[PDB]
Amino acid sequence: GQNFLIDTNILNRIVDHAEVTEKTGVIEIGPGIGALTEQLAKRAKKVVAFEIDQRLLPILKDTLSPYENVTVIHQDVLKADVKSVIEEQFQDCDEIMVVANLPYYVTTPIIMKLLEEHLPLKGIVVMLQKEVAERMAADPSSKEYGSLSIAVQFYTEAKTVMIVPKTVFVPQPNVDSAVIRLILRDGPAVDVENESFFFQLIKASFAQRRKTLLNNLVNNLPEGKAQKSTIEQVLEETNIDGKRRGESLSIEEFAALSNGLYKALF
Amino acid sequence: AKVKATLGEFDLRDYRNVEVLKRFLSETGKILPRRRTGLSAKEQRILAKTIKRARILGLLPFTEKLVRK
Amino acid sequence: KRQVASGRAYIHASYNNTIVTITDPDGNPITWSSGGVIGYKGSRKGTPYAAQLAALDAAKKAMAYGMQSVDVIVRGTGAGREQAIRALQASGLQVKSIVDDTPVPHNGCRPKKKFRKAS
Amino acid sequence: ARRRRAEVRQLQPDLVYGDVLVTAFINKIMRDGKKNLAARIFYDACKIIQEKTGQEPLKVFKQAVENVKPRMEVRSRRVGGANYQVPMEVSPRRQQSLALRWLVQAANQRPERRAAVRIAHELMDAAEGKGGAVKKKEDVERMAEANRAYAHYRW
RNA sequence: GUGGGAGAGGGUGGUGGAAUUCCCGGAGUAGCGGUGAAAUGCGCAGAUACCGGGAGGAACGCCGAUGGCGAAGGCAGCCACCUGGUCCACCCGUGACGCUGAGGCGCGAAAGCGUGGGGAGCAAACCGGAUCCCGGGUAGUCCACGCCCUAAACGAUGCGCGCUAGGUCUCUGGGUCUCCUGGGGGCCGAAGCUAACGCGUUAAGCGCGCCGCCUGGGGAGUACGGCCGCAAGGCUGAAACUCAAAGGAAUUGACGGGGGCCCGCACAAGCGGUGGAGCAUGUGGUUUAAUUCGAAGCAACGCGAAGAACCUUAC
RNA sequence: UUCCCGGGCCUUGUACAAGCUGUACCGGAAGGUGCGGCUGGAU
């Protein structure tokens, strides 16, 4: 199902927050009812909507047929590298950015893979459930902060632009939604580390969330019991008490721990 | 009929009189309700306690198997 | 082989599968039959007819080994208890004793999700 | 019906033999209102049996009919998206109905060219105790009492 | 005070069985488990089903209740020890010694934390399998100390005392014993009360005493300050701004995953049929100069049109 | 009447003119699942 955006100017509002101009050509992940692509094609040189089920292709045959900007492409969003289609189709385009209309259900894999690809582009604006909105902007404390937060903030800076209530979506979602903007940072937020071990550490600290950082490290991390002293040892060096909880620490200090621990037991 | 019906004077607290206590069980070694035994609340409770005690002594079965389909 | 001419029958009656094991008086299993033996598959293994066929099959392979009379010792609450009983009683066996022996917990371990919401 | 139990029409006894079963049989034979043709075909069968067998036909009609009277039928039942073909016991009315129907349909599918000839051999064969109608009668018979496990669905 | 009574009231120390899992044999082969369809998974190193012996760790089947005890949260295998509350009978003793109680001090389901142990099963997160399910699975659920201290913590009903018809059931005492008299737990109902629903000697009735709390909805149990906590968080608790409503119970309706009953060639019991074949007519598309137009589920389609060679005719 | 279709008279309600709740977690969140509770929900 799709959320019927019966209210007008909301699409335009999210567009304005996205700052997509004539100079900018933007990819839409989900064609939907074409309205999003409708405004996108209006104010942009080139817009593409990726279709995973060609059963859904016929509709635009009357909707996006009047508009000439739209280049309909039939390829699974997960089973492709967007970079190639960007190079081919959007050679004429200047600014590469994404606007999506996913069912709040499929966002996270898509948005994570997009950033996995290390694809150079302007950014991404999406609407999704409040509590899942990158777990809000998120910060090194509070319930919202999670592993997702650290990953996303590592790749790109984060900002939630708007929060949208009911009566905006016809199949009343029983849950409020929100619109977030992401802009690709010039390389890593972190200075330097190994990516794999860093992500492993990030996951390990947040496994048993309520327990202390020290306990999370001793349990979740492979082995760990034998090398526990060494573990706590590095914590003395990096100026972090084990009695802190993972939620309390910031991303940079997570990396500072990653570097220390990497050279210790890894 | 009822179990209480087909019995004379006896002591309900005696955890060794198996000859009578066996009756208050089903085909399986399960204690019959007050529908079947025909006792008041107090006597039913005291009998149940006695039956449990007797079971523990090994005089009565904790459970059985019915000789039917 | 054993030619003891008398054993016992354990009928494991599950909702999904019906198994019958014929054993010597000592309790050591002589032969076993299932729904998969007949080759039946999926949900319809719980269908009574399959259990009838398994029962008859077990009876035939039993008479093959000299069986005359047994003690049916039924287990579980499969959809094919009574029908398999009827099949095996008239299968040609001089069956002596039939007892229900379903192992019920005395409120021990906590059951799985679907067995919750007890009254 | 829902309120009625439905009353059965009473067939007029035959002109020649003074019986109703012949009337019912010819009616089963009867198509497109051709009762004259059916009656003549039946009387030709009567002549055939009378010539080829010494005894009077009517006794043979009854005994053959009995020899093609089903006595244990199977009825479909819908339980939880499943079919239960429960064997039940038929009414005498049902007995005669299926009897006449099966006899006639068996008679029609005989290799012979002439209707009288076909129906005649059919009825003689049914008389002896072997024939298409008889065959199907015992067919449904053996189909019954096979689902005895499903016999507890009283329909 | 004396003589008893009932009870899953609490803490501690022991020990009983059924069941699940795992380790061994005796024996025994080809699948087992799973749903709505399977699939994942396990098994030829011998799995499932079976008998015999062990290792455990949690919870106590029938009794069992519409029942009992506690101030609440809550509490059931059994035996013992220590201990709290309470009911009745004698009317023996003191002589108003009383009720409530802002702060304080304790207790406080589940979840969650710290220091140790434990882990049979079940299962957040997580890993897989088909398209809200099915396999695995750490925390946790367990115990011992110390935290946290919140709920639809509910009878949505503060505690105490006195008064105002009864009927019926049920638990537990007393008596002179199917009739009285106490104390609990339910249902119907006098008077009365209530916006109504309903309550009605277990008051939401008639009165008195003390305590806590309320003053339109949203912002908001939010911010800020303060006090607790290892942390989560808890307690206390606004305003700016914005709407003219928010809400309670009840009455007619029409709708539903709803359920009961009653009907109609509705199914069933039969007969005869188009659907397959050659033609006639009607429509949707195609075609053209136009092949005019209306009718599109039943309730459009041999319908308007119950007579198209020109006429009709509207293209 | 076993069903299926279309009605009629009843009874009962989320919603009009199951649900809720306290904590805990979610790199498949029109939200889901643990653990426990409540009826302000039908046998």
Curated annotation (Swiss-Prot), chain A:
GO terms for molecular function: 16S rRNA (adenine(1518)-N(6)/adenine(1519)-N(6))-dimethyltransferase activity; RNA binding; rRNA (adenine-N6,N6-)-dimethyltransferase activity. InterPro entries: KsgA/Erm, rRNA_Ade_diMease-like_C, rRNA_Ade_Mease_Trfase_CS, rRNA_Ade_methylase_Trfase_N, rRNA_adenine_dimethylase, SAM-dependent_MTases_sf. Disruption phenotype: No visible phenotype. Not essential. Its EC number is 2.1.1.182. GO terms for biological process: rRNA methylation. It is found in: Cytoplasm. It catalyses: adenosine(1518)/adenosine(1519) in 16S rRNA + 4 S-adenosyl-L-methionine = N(6)-dimethyladenosine(1518)/N(6)-dimethyladenosine(1519) in 16S rRNA + 4 S-adenosyl-L-homocysteine + 4 H(+). GO terms for cellular component: cytosol. The keyword rRNA processing applies. PROSITE patterns: RRNA_A_DIMETH, SAM_RNA_A_N6_MT. S-adenosyl-L-methionine binds at residues 3, 5, 30, 51, 76, 101. SUPFAM superfamilies: S-adenosyl-L-methionine-dependent methyltransferases (SSF53335). It is an enzyme of class 2 (transferase). Specifically dimethylates two adjacent adenosines (A1518 and A1519) in the loop of a conserved hairpin near the 3'-end of 16S rRNA in the 30S particle. May play a critical role in biogenesis of 30S subunits. Belongs to the class I-like SAM-binding methyltransferase superfamily. rRNA adenine N(6)-methyltransferase family. RsmA subfamily. This is Ribosomal RNA small subunit methyltransferase A.
UniProtKB/Swiss-Prot annotation, chain B:
The keyword RNA-binding applies. Keywords: Ribonucleoprotein, Ribosomal protein, RNA-binding, rRNA-binding. It comes from the Bacteria. The keyword Signal does not apply. One of its GO terms (molecular function) is small ribosomal subunit rRNA binding. GO terms for biological process: translation. GO terms for cellular component: ribonucleoprotein complex; ribosome. Part of the 30S ribosomal subunit. Forms a tight heterodimer with protein bS6, also interacts with protein uS11. Binds to the C-terminus of IF3 and to the central section of Era. Located on the back of the platform of the 30S subunit where it stabilizes the close packing of several RNA helices of the 16S rRNA. Forms part of the Shine-Dalgarno cleft in the 70S ribosome, where it probably interacts with the Shine-Dalgarno helix. Belongs to the bacterial ribosomal protein bS18 family. This is Small ribosomal subunit protein bS18.
From Swiss-Prot, chain C:
GO terms for cellular component: ribonucleoprotein complex; ribosome. Residues 99-119 are annotated as: Disordered. GO terms for biological process: translation. One of its GO terms (molecular function) is rRNA binding. Pfam families: Ribosomal_S11. Residues 109-119 have a biased composition (Basic residues). Located on the upper part of the platform of the 30S subunit, where it bridges several disparate RNA helices of the 16S rRNA. Forms part of the Shine-Dalgarno cleft in the 70S ribosome, where it interacts both with the Shine-Dalgarno helix and mRNA. Belongs to the universal ribosomal protein uS11 family. Part of the 30S ribosomal subunit. Interacts with proteins S7 and S18. Binds to the C-terminus of IF-3; however exactly how IF-3 interacts with the 30S subunit is unclear. May contact the C-terminus of Era. This is Small ribosomal subunit protein uS11. It comes from Thermus thermophilus (strain ATCC 27634 / DSM 579 / HB8). The gene is rpsK.
UniProtKB/Swiss-Prot annotation, chain D:
InterPro entries: Ribosomal_uS7 (IPR000235), Ribosomal_uS7_bac/org-type (IPR005717), Ribosomal_uS7_CS (IPR020606), Ribosomal_uS7_dom (IPR023798), Ribosomal_uS7_dom_sf (IPR036823). Pfam families: Ribosomal_S7. One of its GO terms (cellular component) is small ribosomal subunit. Keywords: Ribonucleoprotein, Ribosomal protein, RNA-binding, rRNA-binding, tRNA-binding. Transmembrane segments: none annotated. GO terms for biological process: translation. The keyword Electron transport does not apply. This is Small ribosomal subunit protein uS7. It comes from Thermus thermophilus (strain ATCC 27634 / DSM 579 / HB8).
